[PDB]
Structure formats: structure tokens, C-alpha cells
Design a protein around this ligand. Structure first.
Ligand SMILES: CCCCCCCCCCCCCCCCCC(=O)OC[C@H](COP(=O)([O-])OCC(O)COP(=O)([O-])OC[C@@H](COC(=O)CCCCCCCCCCCCCCCCC)OC(=O)CCCCCCCCCCCCCCCCC)OC(=O)CCCCCCCCCCCCCCCCC
Ligand SMILES: CCCCCCCCCCCCCCCCCC(=O)OC[C@H](COP(=O)([O-])OCC(O)COP(=O)([O-])OC[C@@H](COC(=O)CCCCCCCCCCCCCCCCC)OC(=O)CCCCCCCCCCCCCCCCC)OC(=O)CCCCCCCCCCCCCCCCC
Ligand SMILES: CCCCCCCCCCCCCCCCCC(=O)OC[C@H](COP(=O)([O-])OCC(O)COP(=O)([O-])OC[C@@H](COC(=O)CCCCCCCCCCCCCCCCC)OC(=O)CCCCCCCCCCCCCCCCC)OC(=O)CCCCCCCCCCCCCCCCC
Ligand SMILES: CCCCCCCCCCCCCCCCCC(=O)OC[C@H](COP(=O)([O-])OCC(O)COP(=O)([O-])OC[C@@H](COC(=O)CCCCCCCCCCCCCCCCC)OC(=O)CCCCCCCCCCCCCCCCC)OC(=O)CCCCCCCCCCCCCCCCC
Lengths: 96, 62, 200, 231, 62
């Protein structure tokens, strides 16, 4: 009911400023430009991460286990890993 | 083949398959409400109705 | 896997022709020949070897026998057209992958896009000028020739040079800015006075 | 294999392999009390206790969704420690970091716990998926053992036990059954078993140089039109 | 460089270096024998001498 709702009018905007119809064009363009730029910056951290986690280790340093490698080793081993461990344990620790 | 037959049905009305090239063609019924909201404008009536005949002095009417 | 055969068939199209099922019609490679590759002469030797093994190196049998075209290349232009319509961006992406491995600078890419979009912009204005000439023709002025590059004693307007100097001084006429005068809204005063007179 | 040939690969303007205090123009300089009027600094001595509280928060808030799985809690602890032990073992001199390494890591871990408190951290979602896939396989084995059936893992273990007896019964000249020989016996059985399963193609190229995909169908053309469904 | 300098001397008269493009420009002396063998033709005189002024009725003179 208040006069603040008059701002929703675009039929007669040419009677006050007629500026809204041109500024939102820039805002849509500015959003598109930042979409292309920011998506490039954030997404392109993967080639560095994919390379470092696979080539940055050296034999004169200790490679320490990360969180994901702790969970995968303990809670995501396959059947062959389970067999090979017990196969080594039964033959050498039990049966000698 | 099916989409080619369906495009044939549409292209009878659309005409030109390329974009930004032409307009579709639809024959509509003639009633009293044709152009009802532009009857006030004179230049719209002249552009729609009148095909003027060029004279020897080839100019737009003064 | 379980859903592999169903999904692979749903994703891509296979060849339905059995052109190579017929033995003697199979080509030796002499129908579509590569002419400029550096191993060109090795291709011809393999074609000759294929022709010699088919006749046990008695090529008189090939001369008397019937020669066939490459049936496997039939309707190949139509098949590529249908893939281009099915997935135009996927067809363009994979057909240009090897070419897009070499990426030009940001300047060259910007020049390609700028001159291409600038050419389309001039084409759009050229189309709009043709509608002006049609309105001029209907208004009663017969038109000899066409275009706006006046040969005679008239001023021309070439169109905005797509460089920042002219793009800062000039800008095209926005049709949406030509409006009905707002004094039209003052006719509504007649309605408010009539409603009060009629006791509405 | 292949080694980096550039001898100056790890050279920076601040020294060899220096990723703790890179060289820039606005370098840190001391402040003198007698000459300093006022100062605006955000450094403090609160990172130590914030480091302790952050570990307790991350541990306790993640254990909310473990459903009392004791093995998962102990596994998560080992993983959580590996995240907090980064500055203590890294090659980077975390004590020589530009503007305080302790503050930097504490603020970095607080961003992790904020995601943890909402149960949206990717390490959490990865843990639930890995644990569900693990328990589904353990439940499959339990149902086969209750039914008196032998699990696939026991069949290989029993098959591998009789292979060692057969090899050590024929190898009488030498009596040193090394772990190398024990390994290649199992791997020979593992390859044969892996090749027996109907697995999706993992390697790019099969026995020939050609790829093992569904797209690797070239001429000759010998397939007819696709047939429809049967009634 | 020498041939380029010599080409500069010629192009002061020839004008356009490309073939089938234009004509050379030579200013000649005005004497009584200019166009002496085409004085009979009237259309040659009108093409050389007269630059007619187009009117509103834009047509060649009847
Ligand atoms: C008495 C009353 C009745 C009177 C009847 C009178 C008429 C007689 C009827 C019969 C006439 C023919 C006689 C029998 C011929 C049999 C020959 C044969 O064995 O098959 C050869 C031929 C072999 O083809 P193929 O080996 O399988 O593959 C072709 C190659 O592999 C190549 O494949 P490709 O992938 O490489 O593509 C290239 C291809 C075609 O590629 C193209 O580029 C052509 C593009 C055409 C389509 C685009 C047109 C552009 C306008 C539309 C735009 C499309 C936009 C789509 C995209 C949207 C926008 C992005 O090149 C060709 O042109 C091939 C055409 C056949 C070769 C003939 C020599 C061609 C040179 C002449 C070229 C000019 C004509 C082209 C017409 C093309 C029609 C297919 O097959 C046929 O020609 C089939 C035709 C038989 C159809 C019978 C239909 C029923 C007949 C009755 C119809 C009634 C009509 C009534 C008319 C009324 C009067 C107006
Ligand atoms: C050479 C330089 C000059 C080139 C000039 C350009 C040529 C014309 C291009 C005009 C572009 C208009 C774009 C239309 C909208 C497309 C938007 C889209 O997302 O497309 C995806 C869309 C696929 O998505 P989908 O909807 O899921 O369809 C797949 C379904 O599985 C469908 O089921 P299905 O797979 O089982 O069906 C078989 C499949 C394969 O079968 C075929 O393709 C053969 C059928 C050919 C029929 C003849 C087509 C003639 C043109 C279409 C009809 C005229 C225009 C109709 C209205 C189009 C505008 C919506 O058919 C299809 O792929 C879809 C059917 C195609 C449309 C058929 C029906 C037409 C009427 C549509 C009615 C709805 C709108 C009402 C009218 C609105 C008017 C206001 O593709 C299309 O539908 C057609 C795209 C055609 C545009 C590509 C043309 C070639 C590329 C242009 C040149 C590029 C140069 C740039 C190079 C840059 C290098 C860096
Ligand atoms: C065309 C010949 C005459 C026609 C007769 C037909 C001849 C038969 C052949 C025709 C078939 C092929 C056509 C040519 C294709 C190009 C050849 C090729 O494939 O080589 C591989 C070629 C790889 O190049 P590369 O030599 O191996 O290595 C380049 C290195 O990166 C770095 O190399 P760099 O460091 O040494 O130098 C950098 C730069 C070299 O610098 C440049 O190339 C300068 C380019 C500056 C801009 C030129 C704009 C062209 C004017 C277009 C404006 C409209 C035309 C009308 C208005 C102007 C009138 C003149 O590299 C290049 O760009 C290489 C391309 C150079 C030759 C091609 C240039 C063609 C320009 C057109 C000439 C005039 C045509 C007049 C139009 C006639 C119409 C009646 O592929 C490319 O990537 C370059 C092509 C351009 C790609 C630029 C990025 C475009 C991205 C657009 C994204 C937006 C698209 C959105 C999607 C659309 C909707 C779905
Ligand atoms: C704390 C340090 C500072 C802060 C650091 C933080 C910076 C963050 C960097 C992050 C990078 C952005 C990440 C997203 C971009 C990815 C997409 C991309 O565009 O990469 C291009 C990508 C990389 O290009 P590149 O071949 O590797 O060359 C890279 C560099 O150019 C290098 O190659 P180059 O060495 O051979 O280049 C030589 C250079 C040599 O240049 C020079 O030696 C001197 C240049 C002086 C410029 C003179 C200015 C004159 C001004 C006159 C103005 C008069 C008119 C003004 C009218 C206004 C109203 C009155 O000349 C150039 O060619 C420069 C390239 C064009 C530069 C355009 C912007 C210039 C100003 C940059 C503002 C930033 C200032 C930072 C402060 C730095 C202070 C040290 O190539 C592509 O084109 C593929 C993408 C397709 C793009 C086509 C469409 C572009 C539009 C959309 C782009 C994305 C949205 C917009 C983002 C910003 C783009 C302008």
C-alpha cells in the first residue's frame, strides 16, 4: 500500500529516470565476465594438485600419509589385499 | 526421417530454416480487432495499406 | 558392466551397412587415395600388394574381372550432416580437437571474435537499410541500383569504424529510446473527472 | 625413468626450496618502543590453545555421525592426526613462515571445522561412502558364513595354501622359500582371477595397440541394422 | 633500391602500378590541333566539355 512499492513500476519509468533499463544490461555483462574469469581461477587448481600428489615425492624424504590415504588403506581395501596379507601371515607367522 | 517430416510440417509456416533471415507466414482471419491498438497511428496505416505509384519526378511525396 | 551395452548404444551411433560383407567388392584402397602424405608411395605399394595377392600376382585376372567402387563410403556426407544436427557442438568440438591443440594468443582470439562479430553487426545494419529502401519504395520513390554507396553527388555514411576512437564518440541509435511523449498520461485526468461526475 | 634436468629447479630469490618466507619488497622490520606512538596488529599468542580446541572440536563433531563405530573412530583419529601433524614434519620450515606460521595454520583449520560442524566437509562425505561400501562387503561375507558357504577370500587362501605345499614338495634341492617366490605365486593367481571377472576395461590398449573401448570399431563394416525388442 | 627509385619516376605519370586498374596522367599543351580528327563528332565534344547539372526531375535531357 505504501509508496515504496512504486519502485516495481516499469511501465512509466520513462517519466522519472529511464536509467534502470540500461544499467541492468551492464550488470548482466559484468556477471558474465566474472563467471568466465572466476570459474577459470578456481577450477584450474586441479592440474597442479593432480601433478604434485603424484610426482612431488622423493626418496630422500619421508612421504607422510594423508587423511584420504588412511581411510582408503584401512576401510577401502579390496579382496586381493585382504588375501595377500593373511596369506603372508598364515605362511610365515603361523606355518613358518 | 521422422524429424525431417516434422520439419516439413513446420517449414510450411516458418519458411526460411536459417535464423535472422526471414519471417514466418500465417494467414489469419480478418476481424474488427485487427491492429486495434495501433489505429491511432497514421504512419502505420500508410505503410500497411498504401502502395504509392512513383512519378517521373521520382520522390517521396512532399 | 551391467548397463554398459545399453548405455554405449544409447550414447553413440554405429554403422548399419554391411558393405564389406561381400568379399570381392572390398576395396584395395584405389578409390580414395591420399596424394600428399609423406608416405604416399608406401600407400601405393600396399594397394599394389593387395591387388597382387588377390590374383596370385596374375594381374590379368584383375583386368578381366569387374572393378567396384568403395561401397563403405556411400551416403557419408548425409551421415555427417545428421550428426552435426544431432549434436552440433559435440561434432565441432571433436572435429577441431587436433586443430585446437595449438592455441593462439589472447590477442589473436580477440581479433577473430572482434572482426567476426563486427562483420555480423554490419550485416545486420545492411539488412535494416534494405527495409528502409523497401519503405521508401512503397512510399512512392522508385529505386535504381541498390545500397548506400552513392555513385553520384550525395553524402555517404560508411558505418562506424570498429576501433575505440569512433566507438567512444559515436553510438548507434537505440530504437527503444524513442518514446511516446509522457503528456499522453495527462488525458487520464478526463477519466478521473468523469468518474466523479457520474458518482462512481 | 625421467628426472628433472634443470639444476636450478628449486631456486627462489629467497633460497633453495624456500616456500616459507618468499622474498618481497615490503619486508618485515623491527619496531622500537621508545619511538612508536601507536600500532595496528592482529598477531597474538592464542594460536596454541586454539590449536588444541580445534582438534577437540573436529574430533568430537565428526564422531557424531559415526554411529558408535569404534574402528571408524580409531581410523578417523589416525587421519585427523595426519592433518594436524603437517607443520611438525613438513620440509617447509613452518617456524620461519612470513608472518607467523602458527596463526596461519590455526585459521586454516578453523575453516575446515566450520564445514565439519555443518556435516558438509568432503572428508566426511568421503568417509561415509567408503564405510558404507566396506560394510556392505563385510555383510556379504557374514551372510555366506552363516549359510555354511565358503567366501571367495577363503577359496583363494585355501587354493594358495595347497600351491605352497606343491612347490615346497618339489623344491627339495633348496629349502629357502623366500617371500619373493611366495608373492609371485599369489600374483599369478590374482591375474588369472582378475582376467576371469567381467570387469570394465581399465587399460587403454588391449593385446594389440588398439583401444579397448566400444568406439574402437573400424572397418570392415559387418553389422546390420539394429533389431527391435521381442514380444 | 635503384629499380624502386626508377619506378618512382615512372609512377609519377602512370599512377596506378596494377594493370587494368586506371590510366596514366600526362598534362599536355593546348593547341589548335587538339582532338583535330574528332571535331566532327558532337557526342565527343559533349563528353569532354560539358558537366551537366542534374535537376529535380532526375533524368538525362530528352
Ligand atoms: C511417367 C510418370 C512418372 C514419371 C517419372 C519421371 C522420373 C523418373 C523416376 C526415377 C528417376 C531415377 C531413375 C532411377 C535411378 C536409380 C539409380 C540408383 O540405382 O540409385 C543411385 C543412388 C545411389 O545412392 P547411394 O549409392 O546409396 O549414395 C550416394 C553416394 O554414396 C554419395 O553419397 P554422399 O554422402 O557422398 O552425398 C553426396 C550425394 C548427395 O550429396 C549432396 O550434396 C546432395 C544434397 C541434396 C540435399 C540438399 C539439397 C539442398 C536444398 C535443401 C537443403 C537441405 C537442408 C538440410 C539441412 C538444414 C539446414 C542446415 O551426391 C549425389 O548427388 C548422389 C545422388 C545420386 C547420384 C546421381 C548423380 C548425381 C549428380 C547430380 C547432382 C544433382 C542432383 C542432386 C540431388 C541429390 C538428391 C539425393 O540412389 C538414388 O539416387 C536413389 C533415388 C531413387 C529414389 C526413388 C524415389 C521414387 C521414384 C518416384 C518419385 C516420384 C517423383 C515425381 C516427380 C514429379 C515431377 C517433378
Ligand atoms: C555452413 C555455414 C552456414 C551454416 C548456416 C547454419 C545452418 C542452420 C543453423 C540454424 C541454427 C538453429 C539452431 C536451432 C536450435 C539448436 C539449439 C541446440 O541446442 O541444438 C541441439 C539440438 C540437439 O538437441 P535435442 O533437442 O535433444 O535433439 C536430439 C534428440 O535426440 C532428438 O531426437 P532424435 O535424435 O531421435 O532425432 C533425430 C535427430 C537427427 O535427425 C536429423 O537431424 C535430421 C533432421 C533434419 C530436418 C531438416 C532440418 C532443417 C532445419 C530445422 C527446421 C527449420 C528450423 C526449425 C526451428 C529451429 C529453431 C528451434 O534429429 C535431431 O537431432 C533433432 C531434430 C532437429 C529439429 C527437427 C525439427 C525442426 C522443427 C523444431 C520445432 C521446434 C521449434 C518450433 C519452431 C520455432 C520457430 C520460432 O540440435 C537440434 O535440434 C538441431 C540443431 C541444428 C543446428 C546445427 C546446424 C549446424 C551448425 C550450424 C553451423 C555452425 C557454424 C559455426 C562453426 C563454429 C566453429 C568454431
Ligand atoms: C582462408 C583462405 C582463403 C579461402 C579459400 C579456402 C581455402 C581452403 C581451406 C579452407 C578450410 C580451412 C579454413 C581455415 C581454418 C584455419 C586453418 C586451420 O585449421 O589450422 C589449424 C589452426 C591452428 O593454427 P596453427 O598454425 O597450427 O598454430 C597457431 C599457433 O597457435 C600460433 O601461431 P602463430 O604464433 O605463428 O600466429 C598466431 C596466429 C596467426 O595470426 C593470424 O592468424 C591472424 C588472425 C587475425 C584475425 C583474422 C580475422 C579474419 C577475418 C574474419 C572476419 C570476417 C571476415 C570478413 C571481414 C574481413 C574481410 C577481410 O595463428 C593462427 O591463428 C593460425 C591461423 C592462420 C591462418 C588462418 C587465418 C584465416 C584468417 C582469414 C583470412 C582472410 C579471410 C577473409 C574472409 C573472406 C570472406 C569472403 O587452428 C586454429 O586454431 C586457428 C584458427 C583460428 C582459431 C582462433 C580461435 C577461435 C576461437 C573462437 C571461439 C568462439 C567460437 C564460439 C563457438 C561458435 C558457436 C558454436
Ligand atoms: C599483484 C600483481 C598484480 C595482480 C596479479 C593478479 C592477476 C590475476 C591473473 C589471473 C588471470 C586471469 C584468469 C582468467 C583468465 C582466463 C581467460 C583468459 O582471458 O586468458 C586468456 C588466455 C591467455 O592468453 P595468453 O596467450 O597465454 O597470454 C597471456 C598474457 O597475455 C601473457 O602473454 P604475453 O607475455 O605474451 O603478453 C604480452 C603483453 C605485454 O604487455 C606489456 O608489455 C605492457 C601492456 C601495457 C598495456 C597498455 C594499456 C593501454 C591502455 C589504453 C586504453 C585506451 C582505451 C581505454 C578506453 C576506456 C574508456 C576511456 O601484451 C599482451 O598481449 C597482454 C594480453 C592482453 C592483456 C589484457 C589486459 C591488460 C591489463 C591487465 C590489467 C591487470 C593489471 C595488473 C597490474 C599489473 C602491474 C604490473 O588466452 C585466451 O585467450 C584463451 C581464453 C579465451 C579468451 C578470449 C576472450 C577473453 C574475454 C574473457 C576472458 C575472461 C573474462 C575476463 C578476465 C580478464 C581478461 C582481460
Amino acid at each position: 500500500i505504501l509508496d515504496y512499492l512504486f519502485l516495481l513500476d516499469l511501465n512509466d519509468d520513462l517519466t522519472r529516470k529511464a536509467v534502470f533499463e540500461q544499467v541492468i544490461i551492464f550488470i548482466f555483462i559484468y556477471c558474465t565476465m566474472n563467471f568466465l574469469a572466476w570459474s577459470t581461477v578456481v577450477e584450474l587448481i586441479w592440474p597442479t594438485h593432480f601433478f604434485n600428489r603424484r610426482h612431488s615425492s622423493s626418496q630422500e624424504f619421508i612421504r607422510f600419509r594423508t587423511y584420504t590415504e588412511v581411510l582408503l588403506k584401512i576401510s577401502a581395501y579390496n579382496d586381493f589385499f585382504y588375501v595377500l596379507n593373511n596369506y603372508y601371515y598364515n605362511q610365515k607367522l603361523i606355518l613358518k | 526421417f521422422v524429424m525431417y517430416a516434422f520439419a516439413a510440417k513446420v517449414l510450411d509456416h516458418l519458411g526460411n530454416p536459417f535464423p535472422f533471415s526471414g519471417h514466418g507466414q500465417i494467414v489469419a482471419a480478418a476481424d474488427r480487432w485487427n491492429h486495434w491498438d495501433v489505429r491511432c497511428y497514421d504512419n502505420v496505416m500508410k505503410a500497411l495499406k498504401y502502395i504509392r505509384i512513383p512519378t517521373v519526378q521520382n520522390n517521396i511525396p512532399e | 558392466s551391467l548397463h554398459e551395452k545399453m548405455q554405449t548404444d544409447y550414447l553413440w551411433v554405429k554403422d548399419h551397412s554391411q558393405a564389406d560383407s561381400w568379399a570381392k567388392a572390398r576395396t584395395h584402397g584405389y578409390n580414395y587415395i591420399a596424394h600428399t602424405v609423406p608416405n604416399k608411395k608406401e600407400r601405393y605399394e600396399m594397394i599394389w600388394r593387395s591387388m597382387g595377392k588377390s590374383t596370385d600376382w596374375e594381374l590379368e585376372k584383375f583386368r578381366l574381372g569387374k572393378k567396384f567402387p568403395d561401397r563403405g563410403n556411400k551416403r557419408r556426407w548425409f551421415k555427417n550432416l545428421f550428426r552435426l544436427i544431432k549434436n552440433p557442438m559435440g561434432y565441432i568440438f571433436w572435429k577441431t580437437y587436433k586443430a585446437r591443440l595449438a592455441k593462439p594468443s589472447l590477442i589473436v582470439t580477440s581479433m577473430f571474435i572482434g572482426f567476426t562479430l563486427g562483420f555480423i553487426k554490419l550485416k545486420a545494419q545492411s539488412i535494416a537499410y534494405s527495409k528502409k529502401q523497401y519503405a521508401t519504395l512503397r512510399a512512392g520513390k522508385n529505386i535504381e541500383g541498390s545500397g548506400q554507396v552513392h555513385f553520384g553527388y550525395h553524402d555517404q555514411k560508411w558505418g562506424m569504424p570498429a576501433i575505440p576512437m569512433f566507438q567512444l564518440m559515436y553510438y548507434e541509435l537505440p530504437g527503444n529510446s524513442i518514446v511516446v511523449n509522457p503528456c499522453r498520461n495527462q488525458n487520464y485526468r478526463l477519466y478521473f473527472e468523469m468518474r466523479k461526475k457520474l458518482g462512481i | 625413468g625421467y628426472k628433472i634436468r634443470n639444476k636450478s629447479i628449486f631456486w627462489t630469490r629467497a633460497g633453495w626450496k624456500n616456500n616459507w618466507h618468499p622474498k618481497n619488497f615490503n619486508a618485515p622490520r623491527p619496531s622500537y618502543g621508545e619511538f612508536t606512538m601507536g600500532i595496528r596488529c592482529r598477531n597474538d599468542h592464542h594460536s596454541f590453545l586454539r590449536y588444541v580446541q580445534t582438534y577437540r572440536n573436529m574430533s568430537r563433531h565428526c564422531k557424531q555421525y559415526f554411529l558408535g563405530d569404534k574402528q571408524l573412530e580409531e581410523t578417523f583419529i589416525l587421519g585427523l592426526r595426519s592433518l594436524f601433524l603437517v607443520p611438525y614434519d613438513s620440509q617447509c620450515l613452518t617456524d620461519q613462515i612470513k608472518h607467523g606460521g602458527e596463526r596461519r595454520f590455526v585459521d586454516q583449520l578453523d575453516r575446515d571445522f566450520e564445514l565439519i560442524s555443518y556435516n558438509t566437509h568432503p572428508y566426511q562425505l568421503f568417509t561415509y561412502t567408503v564405510r558404507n561400501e566396506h560394510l556392505a562387503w563385510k555383510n556379504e561375507q557374514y551372510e555366506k558364513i552363516q549359510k555354511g558357504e565358503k567366501t571367495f577370500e577363503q577359496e583363494l587362501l585355501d587354493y594358495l595354501d595347497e600351491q605352497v605345499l606343491a612347490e615346497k614338495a618339489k623344491l627339495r634341492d633348496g629349502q629357502n622359500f623366500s617371500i619373493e617366490r611366495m608373492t609371485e605365486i599369489a600374483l599369478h593367481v590374482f591375474r588369472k582371477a582378475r582376467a576371469g571377472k567381467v570387469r570394465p576395461a581399465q587399460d587403454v590398449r588391449g593385446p594389440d595397440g588398439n583401444v579397448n573401448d566400444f568406439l574402437e570399431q573400424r572397418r570392415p563394416f559387418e553389422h546390420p541394422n539394429p533389431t527391435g525388442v521381442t514380444h
